[PDB]
Amino acid sequence: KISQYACQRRTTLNNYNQLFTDALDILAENDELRENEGSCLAFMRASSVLKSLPFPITSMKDTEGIPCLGDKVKSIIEGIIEDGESSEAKAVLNDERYKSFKLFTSVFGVGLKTAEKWFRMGFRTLSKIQSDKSLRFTQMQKAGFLYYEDLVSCVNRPEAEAVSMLVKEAVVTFLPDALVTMTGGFRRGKMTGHDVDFLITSPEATEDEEQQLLHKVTDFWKQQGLLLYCDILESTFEKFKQPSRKDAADHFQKCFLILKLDHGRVHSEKEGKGWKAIRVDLVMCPYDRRAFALLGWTGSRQFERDLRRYATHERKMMLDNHALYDRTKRVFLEAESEEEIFAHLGLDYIEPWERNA
């Protein structure tokens, strides 16, 4: 029996139901843009469960016993079986508000509020936005426009590995015992990503050394002429606070960067300016919380939502990126690995490449 929870499903990148899930993903994305959180959630859960199937849906009978498939979702599956396409998702793809929101948010530094503002001003193209002499842009948006073509191109694994080398070389210069792990999509087996994310932790660093590392590493890159953009978010982490009841927020020290990646550092099968701008995120966490942070930053976003929902509703536990709290035993549960977190929750271990929910 297929569980309603992504954390009780194995979701690998061999998606047999891309015809259905690409449509459901578009409808969920439109509901996010239209601020319809409820309808968004229903389409995300339906898309997620179909991504886990080991076979393609070829008739309505194949949907029997599959959870998270309400009547609205089943009508969308029925229509795709009939025609080979979703009329509902096709209408979203041709919608002017949806097209504008996709296009504008594809710029680094542009979220739902700025995209809505520009749309209501009558803007429809990035060319008209950039060349407008009255518009005022944040420093994030200026970088987003300057390096747009590079940031809109997918980061591949040879590029992610080249970035990993840079991160590790910089980090070990200041903390030689530090552990640097590539997280996000690449850890789940993806060939591409929009960014490259890393979790950094040190077993011997002090609280001050831990705080200063991202400042030292980015100053080093600034000197090297490799830092194209940098925003460091100081930690708001509280060692003894109960985990989030909320989509949980991460309170660890982190930075959102754009790095200059020289082509010579990339060992690929394959030109231009000789470098590529890459979006990189670095997260620093205390050594004892490394398993919770790793589990949170590995994703997918749906796997994280269901993990936290399962912990609350089925185990009366509170989970976030920083800790796991047992409300019955009134104790925080310790973990040296992700395997121990799964064991605490009474879940069979799901490998990172099986978390593509």
Ligand SMILES: O=C(/C=C(\O)C(=O)O)/C=C/c1cc(C(=O)c2ccc(F)cc2)c[nH]1
């Ligand atoms: O790739 C996906 C999700 C989908 O593709 C899906 O469910 O379909 C997530 C990867 C991922 C999560 C992040 C964050 O950006 C992140 C995490 C925690 C946080 F507090 C703030 C930001 C980095 N790794």
Ligand code: NA
């Ligand atoms: Na954006």
